[model samples]
Target: KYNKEFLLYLAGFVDGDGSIIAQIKPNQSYKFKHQLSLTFQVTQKTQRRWFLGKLVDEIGVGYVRDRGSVSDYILSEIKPLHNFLTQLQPFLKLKQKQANLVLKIIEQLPLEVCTWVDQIAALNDS
Candidate 1:
């Protein structure tokens, strides 16, 4: 039942109420001392969890997790994030910059996690 305009509405809904997070966090594991992630999320009062489920159904990715009085719609998979954001980017106004930056960042990122570790390993041979 979703239409093109539905996506546009989603763009607007997310623009005002949702959040885009692109971050790098420190890691303790070998070969990956830092980790980067892009996450998209929205929150609603638990009374509206049914609405959150609608997002999951139409967006074709993500799930609705709940807090005590709030519900969250979250999508974190790199593959799905890229594709879903691509579709929403064109319609997004407030978050257009985020969609553009994050989409491209993911596009340019290497598939493997060990790229930087090799660079550091080379310097350690001294």
Candidate 2:
């Protein structure tokens, strides 16, 4: 479902318009667990969903959503996000730091932190 050329193309797309974000949130309890969500996303004009659709089909994950005249294709689940980063890292340029940071955070899973801000800070520091 994927090829080297397509992978490189997608990597170029992401390098220009994509972002990697790790969002930390609280679990069921106030004094208990926290959850970290990893997201890789690219935004484009709403008319360009077909381009994002190709990525969804090949990568086998993520969904497309609309925001006014633009749309976003977001890959958030841990495994797919990790896999995408691993594969795309070599091809990335402008957003390489974000990819590296996100990969590092994923590698250091089971993070323990009291607040989302703290968790982000810790990940950034690492």
Candidate 3:
């Protein structure tokens, strides 16, 4: 249910208060490897429940929870993160570079790279 106005609002909100993170992690369960993750997060004071709930409804995969005085709305899984970024990247300003970099990294990964841990396939890209 996103439109031009919604994208504009989302971009502005994210620029002022949200965070996008792409991390390369050493896989603990696997031997000598890396894992890629993209996260989109926004934190607001406890009173801003409506804002976070609206985000959950719009994004469709977000989880909202209390964090002491603040509440956080987060989307951390890869597919939703990717799709969200793809739509939002064009409107992003402050984090455009980071978003593009994440998109690049995701494009470089093969589909099979994200398979279940039991697959145990090695990735030379690391």
Candidate 4:
């Protein structure tokens, strides 16, 4: 899913900015372009919601960029998820046992989306 352009965008992504909005709320209603919506919706539902939270816990992880833009903890919190998914050769293979185990564990950890947003909000303290 990642390409050169994607990496470039991530490299300069500003905390609390609207750039990631495309990923968060893709426009599906538009006709003649079901492709974008299908891709993104799949990502949000299967990748972000189900896979990422669990993968984060399975692998040891950390984060970079701690200039108050995004909190160290939140950044650290999210890295393992991204890492595990990205490292997969082609796709994440979640068997039933692994799936149940991950779900049970992720049920406890607080992967609050807004917490990261709030952390970015605190960056305006500058």
Candidate 5:
């Protein structure tokens, strides 16, 4: 299980509209980006799977409740978060970094979601 600081760090992204993207509207096949925030209870253990779960849960349940649309926000956020997780490997050991690395890497490759997922799978398998 993970701890508090990690939860707060993730909450920054999750609750800061970092989970979604905003597009030009009109349901275009492509999404631009959006501004929204996700809330995480402080009492729960935090982990990357929860990060992914947030997206999955939102789509699986929240979307239907909110609207019949699927926003690209979660997909967009997943890319950078995925990268941050890779660079933040030491964090699982309970060590922390400035997190400038997280922000920096995410901004550089905002659309590297596939790369991120693959990296996680590879890491888990190894």
Candidate 6:
């Protein structure tokens, strides 16, 4: 388990300056013609790049990047997002709704290949 104190600080930091988002885009190479994306991102000034870097260390997995005048602590992989966001959710304030929505989206995502097979199998019978 991660430190709850740190989680609260991050949660508070996110509520004001961070965001949680879900989006979808089309890509020819995706198994389905479209891909779904989940993002938990933090924004800060370039001078505070060290904060984002330290944030990465605390989360165990993720990266920090400088984007022009700003820097970001970007976590996109679902496994770590799943694990960390669930922990982060409880301490959130303003963005809690979006947090819960994205977490539930991840929860509802059908990750099973066999589930897809049977859906098409029944369609063939119909």
Query: What value of lDDT does candidate 6 attain over all alpha carbons?
Result: 0.73
Model 3 lDDT, residue 26, Cα:
64
The 10 consecutive residues of candidate 5 with the worst lDDT sum are 36-45
Ranking by lDDT: 1, 6, 2, 3, 5, 4
Q: Which consecutive 10 residues in model 3 have the weakest lDDT in total?
A: 117-126
Per-residue alpha-carbon lDDT of candidate 5 for residues 1-126, written as tens digits (9 for 90 to 100): 234555455545444433222212223344543322111111222323454455445333221112123222232343444444444344332222213333433444344432332232312342
Screening candidate 1 with a backbone cut-off below 3 angstroms (N, C-alpha, C), the clashing residue pairs are: none
Note the residue pairs that clash in candidate 2: none
**Per-candidate count of clashing residue pairs (backbone under 3 Å):** 0, 0, 0, 0, 7, 0
lDDT of 3 by residue, 30-59 (tens): 666677566789999988878998988877
Per-residue lDDT of 52-90 in model 1, one digit per residue for the tens? 899888886799998899998998857788777888888
Stretches of model 6 off by over 4 angstroms after superposition:
28-33, 111-126
Candidates sorted by TM-score, descending order? 6, 1, 3, 2, 5, 4
Badly placed stretches (over 4 Å) of model 2 are: 28-33, 111-126
Summing lDDT over every window of 10 consecutive residues in candidate 6, give the lowest-scoring window.
113-122
CA lDDT, every prediction?
0.74, 0.73, 0.71, 0.27, 0.33, 0.73
Candidate 2, residues 1-126, lDDT tens digits: the string is: 335667787778787787776766568775545766778888889888887787678777989888889988898867777778887888877776667777777775442432433444534653
Instruction: Compute the lDDT of residue 103 as modeled in candidate 2.
Output: 78
72 in model 2: Cα distance from truth in Å? 1.2
Clashing pairs in 4: none
**Winner by lDDT between candidate 5 and candidate 2:** 2
Worst 10 residues of 4 by lDDT: 35-44
Query: Which candidate number has the best TM-score?
Result: 6
